[PDB]
């Protein structure tokens, strides 16, 4: 089996991308943020406290003939931004882009934090990291990818995120029309449960490539590219109005700048992020200051190749017994 689904940015900044997923019987369509940085599939539901629901589409398990309560099981998760949710757990059929999994654990939110209530476009998250990070207790549940792998034509799923434009998430096949050249694969470490890999270096603009090892994670659910402080300082040093701003929380620069590109290594290959993708957006509508798309990871603790980097490439999450991460230009 395979599936293929359109993923669309939630706003004109590409802050995040949603992908419709059909849950239950008959199917209830919810738009989820596919998150390779976590391993829970959770949704707003008929169980979520009413005052914490502000525009989202809820799953109602009592209307699904295939839903089953997983007795005794509860979950609680917090994310890097401080947001959180918790609740209980059903299994149900879940389909993405025509690929159906039966008995997928669907985590039903009894409570969600303020940031999720204010995000009207995101109905829940679909976690695609390794199932060791899943937060269901007492027994952890597999992600939708792990449950699909027995039926997939190939144990793989690709992310092709667009720049201010829709993209695609494919499961089970590699679309050779979707990228140019060849894919370079690199080793993944699953010791922390993440799609964790080591970039071989970087260059800014038309400058020299510096070989230096950058361990980071590929996270579709983080917007920006967070790199070590001295690498990010080398980048902004090439942009004449750029400065670090404590008030806004990162490097800002005049919107009227043309920004250099940023290249990162994958083994012997090079991925180039166009300058325009790094120009994330004005800090306020009508501002002449813009927020940059590469920021320091020092405060985070880990380096994160978020959507600004992944949307410059076609990325293959190879979930064979020894996983790997493939990157091609597109």
């Amino acid at each position: 089996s395979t599936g293929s689904a359109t993923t669309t940015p939630i706003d004109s900044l590409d802050d995040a991308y949603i992908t419709p997923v059909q849950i239950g019987t008959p199917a209830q369509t919810l738009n989820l943020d596919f998150d390779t940085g976590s391993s829970d599939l959770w949704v707003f539901s008929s169980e979520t406290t009413a005052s914490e629901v502000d525009g989202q589409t809820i799953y109602t398990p009592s209307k699904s003939t295939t839903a089953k309560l997983l007795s005794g099981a509860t979950w609680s998760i917090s994310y890097g931004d401080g947001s959180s949710s918790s609740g209980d757990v059903y299994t149900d059929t879940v389909s993405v882009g025509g690929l159906t999994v039966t008995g997928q654990a669907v985590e039903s939110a009894k409570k969600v934090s303020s940031s999720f209530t204010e995000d009207s476009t995101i109905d829940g998250l679909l976690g695609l990291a390794f199932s060791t990070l899943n937060t269901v207790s007492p027994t952890q549940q597999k992600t939708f990818f792990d449950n699909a792998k027995a039926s997939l034509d190939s144990p793989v799923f690709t992310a092709d995120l667009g720049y201010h434009a829709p993209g695609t998430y494919n499961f089970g096949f590699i679309d050779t029309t979707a990228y140019t050249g060849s894919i370079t694969y690199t080793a993944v470490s699953t010791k922390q449960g993440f799609w964790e890999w080591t970039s071989t270096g970087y260059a800014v603009g038309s400058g020299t490539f510096k070989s230096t090892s950058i361990d980071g994670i590929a996270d579709t659910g983080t917007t920006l590219l967070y790199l070590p402080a001295t690498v990010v300082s080398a980048y902004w040093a090439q942009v004449s109005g750029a400065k670090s701003s404590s008030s806004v929380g990162g490097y800002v620069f005049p919107c009227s700048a043309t920004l250099p590109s940023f290249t990162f290594g994958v083994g012997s290959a090079r991925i180039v992020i166009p300058g325009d993708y790094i120009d994330f957006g004005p800090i306020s509508t009508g501002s002449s200051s813009c927020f940059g798309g590469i920021q320091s990871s020092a405060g985070i603790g880990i380096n994160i190749f978020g959507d600004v980097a992944l949307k410059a490439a076609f990325v293959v999450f190879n979930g064979a017994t020894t996983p790997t991460l493939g990157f091609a230009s597109k």
């Binding site: 802050d15 940085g37 976590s38 391993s39 994310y79 998250l125 937060t135 983080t222 917007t223 994160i304």
Partner: peptide
Amino acid sequence: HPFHXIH
């Protein structure tokens, strides 16, 4: 309005 998704 960037997002930063487990901790």
